Structure 1
């Protein structure tokens, strides 16, 4: 399938993924397409934060799902 991710700057990125694809797979795809480390990136979708060790189907991600990119920690 295809999903869309919007960054903090509003940039829209299209990712060719699958429902059974792991969170690590999507994080690796985003890292390859952008360069940001997978751990720093966090995807918000329907109030759910994607975490390593799970899949998109765990988060009910479907066709043309919209995700948001955020960070984790600061001092």
Structure 2
């Protein structure tokens, strides 16, 4: 098991079930399943860096119970 939290600019936070080896795109696909956002508009930021689709959570040193910030391109970024 590994949970991470996804927080938007309004403070709304959700929990995802992931693994360290999941890609950033895998996380965007989970957010589309849960909330309906199109992945190509989801921007994820960790440690102030915009996260690349093809890199893994472990490549960003995202830990269990880490928070990743979300914003929607052309909507609220």
Q: Does TM, scored on the shorter chain, surpass 0.5? A: yes
Q: CA deviation at 1:72?
A: 3.3
TM-score by structure 2 length? Answer: 0.86
Paired with 2:73 and 2:33, the residues of 1 have a C-alpha distance of: 20
RMSD value, Cα:
1.4
Secondary structure of the 1:33 match is helix
Residue segments in structure 2 that go unaligned for 5+ positions in a row: none
Structure 1 regions of 5+ residues with no counterpart?
A: none
Corresponding residue for 1:15?
Answer: 16
Match of 1:5 in 2: 6
Give me the whole-angstrom Cα distance separating, in 2, the residues matched to 1:35 and 1:73.
16
Displacement over 6 Å in runs of 4+:
none
- Structure 1 Cα separation of the partners of residues 24 and 58 of structure 2: 9
Normalised by the size of structure 1, how large is the TM-score? 0.88
Count of matched residue pairs: 74
1:73 shift after superposition: 4.6
